[PDB]
A = this chain, B = another copy of it.
Amino acid sequence: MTDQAFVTLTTNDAYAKGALVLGSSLKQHRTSRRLAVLTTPQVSDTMRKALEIVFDEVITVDILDSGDSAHLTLMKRPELGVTLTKLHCWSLTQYSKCVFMDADTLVLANIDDLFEREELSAAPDPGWPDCFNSGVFVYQPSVETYNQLLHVASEQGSFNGGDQGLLNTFFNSWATTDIRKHLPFIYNLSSISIYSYLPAFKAFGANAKVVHFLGQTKPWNYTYDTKTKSVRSMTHPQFLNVWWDIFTTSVVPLLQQFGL
């Protein structure tokens, strides 16, 4: 309850919009858990103030500062900035167990049952299914684990240049051990898989609980018609429309409260 939380990350204003929509969707589906968001100094004051309303806790992380424990690793491997910032989710020891969710995900149903899982639980990644997708995962905050992950980042880096490579390298028993740590795909449904693999989606897609907007174009990169309530042109804009309905209904008017 109070010691468990959903955790996300925003390094800029664009992803802050995603985090705001994500946080709103979790509230919409009545989560009994806390909502926390890791933010960097590059996030504007207005976005930060909006985040302070949607989330129960806003934690500032600045790996560009010499006082940060990951700073030295960043100097060694500067392309891992976002990854190192994300790793700070393990530093949130005020929580006993958390569900990390990237700011480009969207909740479609209550997913509090994820807290029944143990670290490290995650859904299979499409493309190379023996690796888990790091967009949604159940973990246990721990300074020791954070230090171990930072050590791996320093010595090995990441095989994909991002957090997914590093996380799979560290939590390497995932593919061959404990089916319970394999979160069902509906808890982290790839937006790509939805429009690509039509048969499979038509058969199981209705049970989707979380949509993960992957690819170059993010939800906020689309144009949304507020009258027809649909984005402009693609066989299932339904999820993009849900994202935009929440953004239009709850997020934008919230951001307007600060103009006064």
Contact = CB atoms under 8 A, between A and B. Distances in A.
Interface of A: 123-131, 159-161, 165, 175-179, 182, 184-186, 193, 196-197, 199-204
18 contacts: A124-B129, A125-B129, A126-B126, A126-B129, A127-B200, A129-B185, A130-B184, A159-B199, A159-B200, A160-B203, A161-B199, A175-B182, A175-B184, A176-B179, A177-B179, A179-B179, A179-B182, A182-B182
B176 A184 contact: yes
A165 B129 contact: no
A127 B197 contact: yes
A114 B99 CA distance: 35
A128 B175 contact: no
Contacts of A193: 127-128
Copies in the complex: 2
Contacts of A201: 128
A100 B130 CA distance: 21
B179 A128 contact: no
Given A177-B179, A179-B176, A203 B130 contact: no
Q: Which of A124, A159, A160 gathers most chain B CB within 10 Å? A: A124
A141 B202 CA distance: 31
Contact of A129 (B129, B178, B179, B203): B129
Given A175-B184, A184-B176, A128 B128 contact: no
A111 to B, nearest CB: 16
A130 B185 contact: yes
Contacts of A203: 159-160, 165
B160 A128 contact: no
